[PDB]
Amino acid sequence: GTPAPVRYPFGEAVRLDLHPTYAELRERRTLLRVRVPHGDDAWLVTRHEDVRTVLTDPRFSRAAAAGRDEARLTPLVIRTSVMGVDPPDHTRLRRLVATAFSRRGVEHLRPGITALVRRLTDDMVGQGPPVDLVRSFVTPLSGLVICDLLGVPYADRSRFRHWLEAFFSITALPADEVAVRIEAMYGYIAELVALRRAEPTEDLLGGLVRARDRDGSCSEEELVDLANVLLLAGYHTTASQLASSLFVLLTQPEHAELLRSRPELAPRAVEELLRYVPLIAHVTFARYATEDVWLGGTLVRAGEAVLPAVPSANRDAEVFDEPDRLDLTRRHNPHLAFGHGLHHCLGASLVRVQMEVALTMLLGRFPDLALAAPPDEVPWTRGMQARSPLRLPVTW
Numbered sequence: 001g002t003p004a005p006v007r008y009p010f011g012e013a014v015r016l017d018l019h020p021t022y023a024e025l026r027e028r029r030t031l032l033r034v035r036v037p038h039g040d041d042a043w044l045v046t047r048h049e050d051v052r053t054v055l056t057d058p059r060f061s062r063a064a065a066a067g068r069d070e071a072r073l074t075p076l077v078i079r080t081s082v083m084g085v086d087p088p089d090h091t092r093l094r095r096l097v098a099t100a101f102s103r104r105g106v107e108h109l110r111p112g113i114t115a116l117v118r119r120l121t122d123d124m125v126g127q128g129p130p131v132d133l134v135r136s137f138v139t140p141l142s143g144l145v146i147c148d149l150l151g152v153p154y155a156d157r158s159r160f161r162h163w164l165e166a167f168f169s170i171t172a173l174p175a176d177e178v179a180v181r182i183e184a185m186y187g188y189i190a191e192l193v194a195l196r197r198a199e200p201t202e203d204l205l206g207g208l209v210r211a212r213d214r215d216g217s218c219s220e221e222e223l224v225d226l227a228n229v230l231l232l233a234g235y236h237t238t239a240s241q242l243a244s245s246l247f248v249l250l251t252q253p254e255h256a257e258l259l260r261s262r263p264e265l266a267p268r269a270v271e272e273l274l275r276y277v278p279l280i281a282h283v284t285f286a287r288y289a290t291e292d293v294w295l296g297g298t299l300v301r302a303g304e305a306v307l308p309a310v311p312s313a314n315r316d317a318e319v320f321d322e323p324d325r326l327d328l329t330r331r332h333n334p335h336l337a338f339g340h341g342l343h344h345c346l347g348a349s350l351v352r353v354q355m356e357v358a359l360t361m362l363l364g365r366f367p368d369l370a371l372a373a374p375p376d377e378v379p380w381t382r383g384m385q386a387r388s389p390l391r392l393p394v395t396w
């Protein structure tokens with residue numbers, strides 16, 4: 001007899017604020033049996049120590065969820081490519097993109113990103129306040145970076161960024177509208193992969209089709225999934241953390257000017273903005289136990305699902321000194337904004353480089369940068385999986 005399931009999500013995720021139950025649950029050292037919009041009931045994992053465990057312990061599988069009605073907040077189960085398989089499939093698939101995303105491999109992109117940010121703030125200079133930082137800086141920057149690396153025509157952004165938001169939708173779209181766009185995009189990706197047989201390219205997608213076509217290293221659906229997720233995670237998720245990180249600094253401007261006055265702080269400010277800012281609206285993808293695991297006062301049984309509350313982990317007072325204060329100068333930062341262990345975020349370095357350069361130049365070229373509106377009147381996405389302001393008007 002397991003306890004009565006509580007309704008999760010606890011409520012809408014509002015701006016960057018965290019529901020109070022997360023902190024109560026950490027203090028309790030128990031998991032919470034929850035009942036979610038779709039799929040299985042789960043245990044919600046809130047403590048940094050335990051989200052570490054569920055995210056990478058081998059007794060918690062992420063392929064298991066494919067044989068189940070997966071505990072989730074979206075009406076349709078999303079196909080997560082390398083995010084939804086175990087070894088040996090995860091090792092096979094991740095090997096194909098490991099080096100292009102490495103620290104050394106991403107650093108060779110630093111010129112181009114920097115040239116792209118200069119150009120992006122060149123226009124702002126000429127055009128003058130007010131500016132929506134989202135439409136004029138954040139979306140181009142993460143949109144062009146990922147589209148150049150991956151070979152996806154950024155001229156096509158008018159079409160596919162309609163569909164992109166069907167993968168992120170909790171309550172913003174009906175289940176039939178969700179399924180319609182999801183195939184619209186797979187068709188689009190599947191067509192891109194076709195042209196790369198006709199006419200190979202020198203981008204990351206061009207080599208993935210070579211890898212299937214002459215090494216037989218993946219399935220055609222695994223190739224389309226890997227390609228989808230790499231565009232999903234770079235277009236929207238990168239933009240939302242940067243948008244969100246911009247909204248923080250501009251509402252706590254003594255940190256902006258601290259980072260302004262000390263640019264050598266940039267790698268620290270980037271790690272802290274990944275931790276402080278709750279990008280994940282509620283939880284990350286669920287894991288099913290494959291044998292019996294005891295944690296959070298619970299003997300979680302084989303076949304039962306856990307939901308890792310990454311943003312709660314990152315406020316854990318037993319890991320982070322003063323966890324709900326923004327300390328850009330924090331030196332050691334074992335956060336989980338990029339997950340933990342086996343599925344640790346492939347694009348970790350590309351997000352660091354983008355952020356580092358973007359904050360550094362935005363704050364450098366515009367020493368007067370301030371919001372052009374009351375922070376409470378900045379609008380935020382409603383009913384989506386990643387939290388982001390929809391508009392960031394600034395003046396200088």
Ligand code: HEM
Pocket residue numbers: 055082083084094146229230231233234235237238239241242279284285310336337338339340342343344345346347348350351
């Ligand atoms: C601010 C931007 C981003 C954030 C906050 C973020 C966050 C995360 C998190 C938390 C996970 C682990 C999920 C889990 O274990 O439940 C993850 C995994 C992953 N991320 Fe990201 N991500 C970002 C950008 C990107 C980009 C730009 C790419 C690639 C272009 C990317 C590709 C991936 C992939 C492929 C995985 C799965 C890795 C694996 O299964 O081995 N992400 N990310």
Ligand SMILES: CN[C@@H](Cc1ccccc1)C(=O)N[C@H](CO)Cc1c[nH]c2ccccc12
Pocket residue numbers: 078080081083167168169229232233237279280281283284285286385386
């Ligand atoms: C419970 N997934 C949520 C929360 C989340 C989890 C991880 C990162 C960001 C956000 C989500 O927004 N997932 C989004 C929308 O489904 C897509 C996504 C983000 N990172 C991915 C990595 C691989 C495949 C898909 C994604």
